[PDB]
C-alpha cells in the first residue's frame, strides 16, 4: 500500500482539535495505508527541554496514540532517537542542501532581529525532517498549511540526490485533513485551537477531566442572537460548537439545528459538554492502562525494530551512492 509518515512532537497534551482534525482519521486509515508515527524526540531537542519532562512526554504521547486507537500490529509507532539511521541520513542530507535554502526557510525568523543566540539545530532541523520522511519511502505526509513549505524542501533535496546519485528516494506529497472540520478556539472563534494558546480555556485536552470539560464549554464564547444556527461570520462561536458537537456525535449540522429549534445556548452547552465527556472517557481509561502497563515499552521496542529495519537499508543504499565507508 502507499506509505504515510507522521512526525509527532513530544508534548504530552493533544487538543480535541488535533483529534478531530487528524488523529481520528488515522484510526481508520491505519488499515489501508502503511503508517509510521514517529515521536521525533530528536527534533524536540533543538529548544530547551527539561530532561525528565521530555522523557515523560514521550511516554505520555505514545500511550495516548495507542489509546486513541493506533494499532501497533497494523502500524509502526517508534521514538525517533531509537533508529540511528535518522541522524545519519540527516548529515548526508545536510551536505547537499545549500545554506541559502535553510536561511530562506520561512520560519528562521526565530533569528530574533539579531539574537544570534539560537541553537544551530534550529537552522539545521530541516535536513533531519527530510531524513525522517525519505528514509521510509513515504508517499504522503499529512501536514497543515503551516508546514507545506518544509515538505517543499524535502521534495527538492530528494530530487537533488536522485539526480546526482540515482533513483533512490520517493518524492513525497503533502496531503491535508478532510476539509470543513477546522476547530476554532473556544474563547476566540476566529483563532485556531492550539496547545500553544496562552489561555487554557481556549482548548480542551484529551485528558481534561469531566469538571474541566464542563467548565470550559460553559465558558465557550457565543453571540447574543440566542439562536442555534450555523453562520461562519456573524455567529462564529455557535458555529464552532456545532462543528465540534457534530463531528463527535455523528449528527449533521442541520440535524443539530432543527433538534435545538426552539432552545437556547444554556441547554445546548450542557448537552455538548456531555457528548464531549462521553467521547473522551474510554480514551482517558485506555490511556491510563497504557501508561502503567509494561506493554507500552514492548510496543515501542517492536516499533523501533520495525522502523530500523527499513531505515538501515535506506541508509546503506545512501552510503553506497555517496561513496562512504566500505
Ligand X SMILES: Nc1ncnc2c1ncn2[C@@H]1O[C@H](COP(=O)(O)OP(=O)(O)OP(=O)(O)O)[C@@H](O)[C@H]1O
Q: Which three cell numbers stand for residue 273?
A: 459538554
In the complex, the residues that contact a second copy under the rule CB under 8 A are 41-42, 45-46, 49-55, 58-59, 79, 81-82, 84, 87-88, 90-92, 94-102, 111, 116-124, 127-128, 165, 297, 300, 319, 321-326
Least distance (Å) from ligand X to the CB of residue 147?
7
Interaction partner, residue 142 (ligand X, a second copy, none; CB < 5-8 Å by kind): ligand X
Least distance (Å) from ligand X to the CB of residue 48?
16
Q: Annotation-wise, does 148 bind a ligand?
A: no
Q: How many CB atoms lie within 10 A of CB 163?
A: 9
Asked whether position 14 contacts ligand X by CB under 6 A, the answer is yes
Q: Cα–Cα distance between 7 and 141 in angstroms, integer?
A: 9
Angle at 35 between CA 317 and CA 21, to 5 degrees: 135
Q: Cα–Cα distance between 7 and 9 in angstroms, integer?
A: 6
Concerning whether 192 is annotated as a catalytic residue, the answer is: yes
φ, ψ at 170 (rounded to 5°): -95, 135
Q: Annotation-wise, does 114 bind a ligand?
A: no
Asked whether position 183 contacts ligand X by CB under 6 A, the answer is yes
Q: Applying CB under 6 A, which part among 132-140, 187-195, 261-269, 295-303 lies near ligand X? A: 187-195
Of residues 110 through 169, those in contact with ligand X by CB under 6 A are: 142, 144
Q: Applying CB under 6 A, which part among 174-182, 228-236, 262-270, 304-312 lies near ligand X? A: 174-182
Q: Annotation-wise, does 195 bind a ligand?
A: yes
Q: Residue 109, exposed/middle/buried by CB under 10 A (0-12, 13-18, 19+)?
A: exposed
Concerning whether 2 is annotated as a catalytic residue, the answer is: no
- b or e along 3-23 (b: 16 or more beta carbons within 10 Å of the residue's beta carbon)? bbbbbbebbbebbbbbbbbbb
- b or e along 39-61 (b: 16 or more beta carbons within 10 Å of the residue's beta carbon)? bbbbbbbbeeeeeeebeebbbbb
Catalytic residue among 195, 201, 306, 317: 195
Contact flags string 82-121 toward ligand X, x per CB under 6 A: ----------------------------------------
Q: Annotation-wise, does 121 bind a ligand?
A: no
Asked whether position 18 contacts ligand X by CB under 6 A, the answer is yes
Q: How many CB atoms lie within 10 A of CB 226?
A: 12
Q: Applying CB under 6 A, which part among 58-66, 105-113, 193-201, 241-249 lies near ligand X? A: 193-201
Least distance (Å) from a second copy to the CB of residue 45?
5
Concerning whether 111 is annotated as a catalytic residue, the answer is: yes
Polymer length in residues for the chain: 326
Q: Applying CB under 6 A, which part among 8-16, 70-78, 97-105, 258-266 lies near ligand X? A: 8-16
Q: Which three cell numbers stand for residue 214?
A: 464542563
Write the CA distances from 173 to 3, 142, 155, 199, integer angstroms.
11, 9, 8, 34
Q: Annotation-wise, does 194 bind a ligand?
A: yes
Specify the DSSP element, H or E, that contains 38.
strand 34-39
Q: Annotation-wise, does 11 bind a ligand?
A: yes
**Residue ranges in contact with ligand X by CB under 6 A:** 9, 14-15, 17-18, 21-22, 142, 144, 177, 179, 182-183, 192-196
Binding residues for L-tryptophan: 132
> Could you list the active site residues?
111, 192, 195
Amino acid at each position: 500500500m502507499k506509505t504515510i509518515f507522521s512526525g509527532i512532537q513530544p508534548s504530552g497534551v493533544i487538543t480535541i482539535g488535533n483529534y478531530i482534525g487528524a488523529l481520528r482519521q488515522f484510526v481508520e486509515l491505519q488499515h489501508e495505508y502503511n503508517c509510521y508515527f514517529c515521536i521525533v524526540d530528536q527534533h524536540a531537542i533543538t529548544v530547551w527541554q527539561d530532561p525528565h519532562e521530555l522523557r515523560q512526554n514521550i511516554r505520555r504521547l505514545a500511550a495516548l496514540y495507542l489509546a486513541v486507537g493506533i494499532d501497533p500490529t497494523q502500524a509502526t509507532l517508534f521514538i525517533q532517537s531509537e533508529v540511528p539511521a535518522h541522524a545519519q541520513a540527516a548529515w548526508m542530507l545536510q551536505c547537499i542542501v545549500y545554506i541559502g535554502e535553510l536561511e530562506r526557510m520561512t520560519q528562521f525568523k526565530e533569528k530574533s532581529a539579531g539574537k544570534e543566540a539560537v541553537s544551530a539545530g534550529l537552522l539545521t532541523y530541516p535536513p533531519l525532517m527530510a531524513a525522517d520522511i525519505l528514509l521510509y519511502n513515504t508517499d504522503i505526509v499529512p501536514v497543515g498549511e503551516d508546514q507545506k513549505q518544509h515538505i517543499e524542501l524535502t521534495r527538492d533535496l530528494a530530487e537533488r540526490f536522485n539526480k546526482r546519485y540515482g533513483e533512490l528516494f520517493t518524492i513525497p506529497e503533502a496531503r491535508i485533513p478532510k476539509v470543513g472540520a477546522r476547530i476554532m478556539s473556544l474563547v476566540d472563534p476566529t483563532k485556531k485551537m492550539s496547545k500553544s494558546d496562552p489561555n487554557p480555556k481556549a482548548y480542551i485536552t484529551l485528558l481534561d477531566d469531566a469538571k474541566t470539560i464542563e467548565k470550559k464549554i460553559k465558558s465557550a464564547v457565543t453571540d447574543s442572537e440566542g439562536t442555534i444556527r450555523y453562520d461562519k461570520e456573524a455567529k462564529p462561536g455557535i458555529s464552532n460548537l456545532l462543528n465540534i458537537y457534530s463531528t463527535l456525535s455523528g449528527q449533521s449540522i442541520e440535524e443539530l439545528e432543527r433538534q435545538y429549534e426552539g432552545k437556547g445556548y444554556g441547554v445546548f452547552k450542557a448537552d455538548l459538554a456531555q457528548v464531549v465527556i462521553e467521547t473522551l472517557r474510554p480514551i482517558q481509561e485506555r490511556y491510563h492502562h497504557w501508561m502503567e502497563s509494561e506493554e507500552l515499552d514492548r510496543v515501542l521496542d517492536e516499533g523501533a525494530e520495525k522502523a530500523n529495519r527499513v531505515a538501515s537499508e535506506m541508509v546503506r543504499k545512501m552510503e553506497q551512492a555517496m561513496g562512504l565507508g566500505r
